[PDB]
Every structure is written in structure tokens, then in C-alpha cells.
Amino acid sequence: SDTTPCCFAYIARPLPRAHIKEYFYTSGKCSNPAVVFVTRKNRQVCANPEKKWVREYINSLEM
Amino acid sequence: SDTTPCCFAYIARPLPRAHIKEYFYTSGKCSNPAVVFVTRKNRQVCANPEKKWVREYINSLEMS
Amino acid sequence: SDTTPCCFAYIARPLPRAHIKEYFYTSGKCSNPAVVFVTRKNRQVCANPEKKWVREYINSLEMS
Amino acid sequence: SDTTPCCFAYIARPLPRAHIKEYFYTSGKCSNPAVVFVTRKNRQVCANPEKKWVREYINSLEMS
Amino acid sequence: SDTTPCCFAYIARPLPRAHIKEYFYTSGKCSNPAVVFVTRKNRQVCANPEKKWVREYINSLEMS
Amino acid sequence: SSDTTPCCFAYIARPLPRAHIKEYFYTSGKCSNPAVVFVTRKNRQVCANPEKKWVREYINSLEM
């Protein structure tokens, strides 16, 4: 019964890697697939899970 | 935040009126139309725009 | 402020007329032409100018 | 729903660092990618992500 | 005042003629030519001096 | 500012009485010339040179 966050557009220019703290996937019932990066000071940017630079960010955050 | 709050399910019963603090309509690009009530403890509850009890909650919110 | 407000979608069902306080057209630099209604507590809603009820609202929230 | 703030140009001369309080990126729907700085007394300035001085300003605040 | 009002974009869809009451030209030192229509409740719209419907409006406004 | 953007083409010659200065803002980025605009207690907009010293400490005092 609660609201769920969705993304409807992606940023083009890659975010500074050193600024990123966390990440998570948007819900599956959302109209569009998306990854949300969270910077050290609570900035949230909708990224595209299909592009390459987005994946290697995710791999870096967990290895 | 780039993210936009959306709804996929409406609240079953009514909500205590003394608890509601603010309201707003859902996004246009959201798949389903929705009313979101905000409360004293900063939570967001989805409600059906068609049902009666949601309407006068917005209405009496709107006048005094 | 340097930023300018734009709309990328529209509300589906009409809004209670008595709640409407003001209206304005969005800037021409925006991709999608839109009307923005403002309720008595500054809740803003994106509407579609080609629709009918949107126009009739604009005609009457303007005259007298 | 709500209007989304966009930028269509950028300030040429850098802002005083001591005056800036917050930053954020504009939404992806916008035609022009932009940084938005916010001062201590709530002014908003559209900055250019590609040009250098804008980047250290973001780097300095985020890493502090 | 010392500032000078300017326009950097035009609206596409023509305004309802009955809503207009006044008009004026932007200054020549501005980058772009522009007329500004003023509605009954002080809404301002930038228009394009080269398009037909703009001149027909100005004509009807002058045959008062 | 949804419809026209205020721009400057000339700067004021002698400094402004500080006790008359209420608020400031920078001009838009598509304006041909960069400028600082002071707003006074009687709601008049005054253009000032962003390079000249007295204009800067006025802003700095305003923002501290």
C-alpha cells in the first residue's frame, strides 16, 4: 500500500565513481528497468542497467 | 531525486482523519492514477481517487 | 531562479474546479506544451491544452 | 504531477565557494544536462557539468 | 527599473483571442524579435512577429 | 519567471545606499551580458557590474 520509486529517464554523463556510496534496483512492476546510485551526501541518480559503464560501477562496488 | 513515487495498490479501510497532514496527486507518467496522503509521521499512503471517502478528505483539506 | 518548470506528462481525470486558484502556460523552451493549475495551497498540476475540460477551466477561471 | 526544473544556459563567471550550500543534477528528461548550485540564502544557479570549476565545487562538497 | 524584458522562445499553439487585452514589442537590443500578449489577468505570452496569426491578432487589437 | 527574462545592457554609475538593498540575483545565462541585479525596498530592479568591488561585498554581506 506504500509508494514505490520509479525511473523514467537516465543521465548521460557518467557520475564520479569516488562519489558513489550505494546502489539499488527499481521495482519490477515499474514501467522501466533502472539502477539508482546513491552518493555520499544523499544524491540519487537514475542510471541505465544496460550500458557498460553502469555494470563496471556495480562490479567495483562489490569486489 | 530523479525517482518518482508511484502506486500499484490502494488502501483497504479508511484512515483516521486527525492523522492526515498533506495530500498530492500521483505523476502523469505513472501507470495508475493515485492519491497519496501524507501523515504526521511522514508516511505516504496510496488511495483510490474514485472512492468517496478520499474525495472529501481532499475537499475539506482544501477549504479550512 | 535560473531553472524553468516543464511538463512531461498530464493528469488523466479532471480536477475539482473549486480548488483551482490560478493557471499559467509553460515556457516555449519546453518540449511539451502544458497548462499548469494551482490549487488554493499551491499544489500544481500539469494539464493538456488540447483537451476540452482543460480549456473550459482556462476560459472560466479567467472571466469574472 | 509536478513540474520538473530544467536549465537552458549556464553562468559564465564562477560563484563564490563560501556562498554555495548544496548541488544537484537536473533530471534526465531535460534537453540540457546541468548542475544546479544552491546558496545559503536560497538562490539557484545553472552550472555547466563539462567545464572544470563546476567539477571541483561538486567534488569539494561531496567529499566533505 | 533598469532591466529590460526579453524573449528566447515562442509558443506554438495560438492563444484564445478573447482572452487578450493588450500587447507590446520587446526592445531592439534584445537578441530576438518578439511581441508579448497580455491577457485579462496579467498572463504574459511571447509570440513570433513573423507568423500570420500573430499579425491578425495585432490588427484586430488595433481596430478596437 | 515563465514568460520573459530580464536582461541588462548598462551598469549603474554610483553605488547604492546599503540600507535600501533588500535582495539580489544573477541574470540568466542566455542574456547577452552578465549582470548583478539588486532589488530594493521599493521594489525597483537595478543593474550592477559583477566585477566592481562594492557590488561584491554587498552580495557577500547579504549572504552572511
UniProtKB/Swiss-Prot annotation, chains B, C, D, E:
Glycosylation sites: S1
Disulfide bonds: C6-C30, C7-C46
Effect annotated for changing H19A: No effect on inhibition of activity by tick evasin-4
Positions of post-translational Methionine sulfoxide modification: M63
Impact reported for E22A: No effect on inhibition of activity by tick evasin-4
Organism domain of life: Eukaryota
Name the UniProt record assigns to this protein: RANTES(4-68)
Lineage: Eukaryota, Metazoa, Chordata, Craniata, Vertebrata
Gene, per the UniProt record: CCL5
Stretch of the intact protein here: 28 to 91 of 91
